[PDB]
Amino acid sequence: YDIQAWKKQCEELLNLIFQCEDSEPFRQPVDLLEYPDYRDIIDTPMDFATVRETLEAGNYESPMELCKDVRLIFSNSKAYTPSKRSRIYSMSLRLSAFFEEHISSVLSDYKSALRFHKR
Numbered sequence: 018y019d020i021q022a023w024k025k026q027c028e029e030l031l032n033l034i035f036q037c038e039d040s041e042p043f044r045q046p047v048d049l050l051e052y053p054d055y056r057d058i059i060d061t062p063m064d065f066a067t068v069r070e071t072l073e074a075g076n077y078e079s080p081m082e083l084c085k086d087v088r089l090i091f092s093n094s095k096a097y098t099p100s101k102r103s104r105i106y107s108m109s110l111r112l113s114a115f116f117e118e119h120i121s122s123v124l125s126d127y128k129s130a131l132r133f134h135k136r
């Protein structure tokens with residue numbers, strides 16, 4: 018029922034995501050010189066360094082907010098992909114599955130802890 022525990026759990030999951038070769042395309046904000054039409058398609062860029070720095074700044078109030086930004090990395094990949102068979106999109110799908118498998122207990126524990134706090 019530790020309502021703060023999500024933050025270190027998210028730090029550790031980001032560490033695992035950074036060790037994962039599939040996170041390579043998503044570790045730093047997209048280079049617009051390599052993809053000059055990117056901001057014509059993507060309204061809100063997101064990447065794992067931005068998520069980590071937001072977490073470390075103390076600028077997430079909940080793991081739901083972090084989850085929303087991580088999901089935006091993946092929806093940005095889907096939206097930008099010319100093909101569902103793309104290399105970088107295919108890496109996003111595996112990394113998303115890994116992320117979702119690991120974040121589910123972090124969200125459940127947090128929401129349980131906040132319900133207990135409010136009981």
Ligand SMILES: O=C(NCc1cccnc1)N1CCN(C(=O)c2cccs2)CC1
Nearest residue numbers: 042045046047048094097098103105106
């Ligand atoms: O440039 C990066 N990533 C930043 C970066 C900078 C330097 C080194 N390594 C990665 N993109 C943009 C393209 N992108 C896509 O999701 C898709 C492209 C094709 C199909 S989807 C995410 C990865």
